[PDB]
């Protein structure tokens, strides 16, 4: 008898993504879990054209 | 169109929203040539368990 009754709307994919950030910090990479936050260079997103 | 019925059999206490319905053959593989499958269940109390 299953203990993993799972619905159709809630996504554990995004929930775990937020939890890791709240639990610790995401600046430092952890290759064992392949933890590497997709980030953009802040200089290229906002072109600070000095 | 084969319309028949089957007797009572145990039913789970909690029924999820989505249920799978399958019709398969002797080899336990799905027959692709089914163009309509239906199903209707009539729940009833069989016995008691808490006692």
């Amino acid at each position: 008898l299953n203990a993993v009754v799972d619905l159709q709307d809630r996504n554990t994919e995004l929930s775990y993504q937020l939890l890791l950030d709240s639990l610790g910090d995401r600046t430092r990479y952890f290759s064992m879990w392949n933890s590497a936050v997709d980030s953009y260079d802040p200089d290229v997103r906002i072109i600070e054209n000095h | 169109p084969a319309l028949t019925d089957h007797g009572t059999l145990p039913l789970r206490s909690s029924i999820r929203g989505v249920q799978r319905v399958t019709v398969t053959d002797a080899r336990r593989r799905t027959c692709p040539y089914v163009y309509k499958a239906l199903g209707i269940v009539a729940p009833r109390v069989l016995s008691s368990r808490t006692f």
């Binding site: 709307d9 809630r10 929930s15 939890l19 | -």
Partner: protein, 100 residues
């Protein structure tokens, strides 16, 4: 379309067990089965996710929800996505999920 796919050759499930003195593991197991103290957890993003389409060049989008009991609501949180990027996640292949 172009890049070939992966293939799984082996899938093994690893586990790690704490060495607990059997004098205490039995006692821990004994009381942990009385249903007066049994584990209980909550999803971190405790929310029900609903998606509503927005046609192109449409500025105003109204949505409605059929009446129900908002027993223990905790607020909304919304964000706009592109339909190209969002998969279906119902079934194996959304054969329409092209962007990667």
């Amino acid at each position: 379309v172009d890049g070939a796919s992966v293939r799984f050759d082996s899938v093994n499930l690893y586990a790690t067990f704490f060495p607990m003195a059997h004098n205490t593991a039995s006692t821990l197991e004994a009381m942990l089965r009385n249903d007066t103290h049994d584990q209980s957890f909550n999803d971190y993003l405790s929310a029900a996710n609903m998606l509503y389409p927005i046609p192109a060049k449409a500025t105003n989008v109204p949505i409605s929800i059929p009446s129900r009991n908002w027993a223990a609501f905790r607020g909304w949180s919304f964000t706009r996505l592109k339909t190209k990027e969002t998969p279906s996640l119902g079934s194996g292949f959304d054969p329409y999920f092209v962007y990667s």
